[PDB]
Design an enzyme around this catalytic site. Structure first.
Site, short mmCIF file in Angstrom:
data_model
loop_
_atom_site.label_atom_id
_atom_site.label_comp_id
_atom_site.label_asym_id
_atom_site.label_seq_id
_atom_site.Cartn_x
_atom_site.Cartn_y
_atom_site.Cartn_z
CG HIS B 39 21.39 42.01 42.81
ND1 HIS B 39 22.41 41.39 43.49
CD2 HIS B 39 21.39 41.49 41.56
CE1 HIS B 39 23.04 40.55 42.67
NE2 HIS B 39 22.44 40.59 41.50
N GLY B 138 28.21 32.84 43.49
CA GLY B 138 28.91 34.07 43.85
C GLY B 138 29.46 34.77 42.62
CB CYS B 140 26.21 38.45 41.31
SG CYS B 140 24.77 37.36 41.31
#
Lengths: 292, 293
Positions: B39, B138, B140
């Site tokens: 993503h 943040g 990820c």
């Protein structure tokens, strides 16, 4: 809301194993000095009442064996600073991070890299208890630390296990935390108390997250709270403590003596089966800085 | 008894930042491949109904900015494996540890190195909950791992936050844990349960330590234990679990179903102001494997 340790890589590169006689423990290798507990020069017999000044004069460089993983490091000088032995070695650690030696206060937090004979095994986050011990989990010479942007601030080295199962040690300049000595004598941790300013910080954490139910309409006074606190085995709160919480009061709109009324109410009535960020016991090993 | 994380140095040397468009997140740099959530190629809008095959075919190598510290890494190929993006770079990571990829099961523990824009900021110890989520913090593309004899077993990569605050992610082949997808839907974590076998292994750790106030003189059948425990939202205990705790039963002279009886009473009574290594809670994020060690 997890307790997090600092990433430990910068410290891992400094751990070595120090052997003197039959005793092996962990040492910290920074540039060309290895730091470790002075009681490494002690036989089990000396540990009952040692004279470290004289025990080390009888030692020479050849009595110390320093191993950095595979490589043996040659000791070329030795000295004591308070309760830490300083072994000068013939090789500078190429993995030495930017670092400082600092001394912390009770209630402050740090990470510990637990090591076994120069081999790091695990990392965990602690608080220094008000009674100056560490509830933690051979490991002697393992260190505690904080990191601020590439700089490792070493604040703790492990020396002793106390009979209640907690740990006692020194700063990296060999000064003990707490009324303890590096001797095999009778010693015990004092009665411990909960770190009030950390509990308050942690309640602000729950308000920044979506948990508000313990907030009430009331306020209390600094004095009135401290009478409740002392009755419940809690460190007394100072005007400086109130000041450090200022940022979290501005952010959440909950004044500190308002949060203090909340805490006082939780100490007398419990949570009634409700939880604060998952937990049902009050957490005191997060500092105001940690929460920010 | 502290919940300890593995020393994180071997994983810190593999963390990089991956930027595509206005999205930056963490990647894992192993040999000449950077792994990250696919993503990273999505805008906020795309996350409602992302067509990853369509989004990815429109990218070229130079749309991916990979930064390892001060060094920009040149991307020379890319592909997608399930929900992870694999960026081939022109430099093998000199700091690659001995590693493998493993897929874990609910109840298993691991350490997470939480990172922000390729910068590690904290490490914590985790269990994969029975509902396939992580109660983390943040982030990820941060990864979970175990370390056994200097080999790093990567088992988790972070992809999504669920509305209850918990985390969902994949193994390093990009296959999600649980029923979750890398799409902004209405997915929610199912009701979570306690990892029974871990509670019992921990109670065994308490006895080994020298703590036994919670024992009693009862036993239980396996099925009666499960009938009671499930009323407290405890996972059912299987014969595999009983077999797994066998070494600890042998070491403490306490039969597994006898410890089961103690747990039943602990659930009925609570702690009465007492603690078990330390501790004020029934702890379920230490595995039997963890307890022996």
């Amino acid at each position: 809301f997890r307790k997090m340790a600092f990433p430990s890589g910068k410290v891992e590169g400094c751990m070595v194993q120090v052997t003197c006689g039959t005793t092996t423990l962990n040492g910290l290798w920074l540039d060309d000095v290895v730091y470790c507990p002075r009681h490494v020069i002690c036989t089990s017999e000396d540990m009952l009442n040692p004279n470290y000044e004289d025990l080390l004069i009888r030692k020479s460089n050849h009595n110390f064996l320093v191993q950095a993983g595979n490589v043996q490091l040659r000791v070329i000088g030795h000295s004591m600073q308070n309760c830490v032995l300083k072994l000068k070695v013939d090789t500078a650690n190429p993995k030495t991070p930017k670092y400082k030696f600092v001394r912390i206060q009770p209630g402050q937090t740090f990470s510990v890299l637990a090591c076994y004979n120069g081999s790091p095994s695990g990392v965990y986050q602690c608080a220094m208890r008000p009674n100056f011990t560490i509830k933690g989990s051979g490991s002697c010479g393992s260190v505690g630390f904080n990191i601020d942007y590439d700089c490792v601030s070493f604040c703790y080295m492990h020396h002793m296990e106390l009979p209640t199962g907690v740990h006692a040690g020194t700063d990296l300049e060999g000064n003990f935390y707490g009324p303890f000595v590096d001797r095999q004598t009778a010693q015990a941790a004092g009665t411990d108390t909960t770190i009030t300013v950390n509990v308050l910080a942690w309640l602000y954490a729950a308000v920044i997250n979506g948990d508000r139910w313990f907030l009430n309409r009331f306020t209390t006074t600094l004095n009135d709270f401290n009478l409740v606190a002392m009755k419940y085995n809690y460190e007394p709160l100072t005007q400086d403590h109130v000041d450090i919480l200022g940022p979290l009061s501005a952010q959440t709109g909950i004044a500190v003596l308002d949060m203090c009324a909340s805490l006082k109410e939780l100490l007398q009535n419990g949570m009634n089966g409700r939880t604060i960020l998952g937990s049902a016991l009050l957490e005191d090993e997060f500092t105001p800085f940690d929460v920010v």
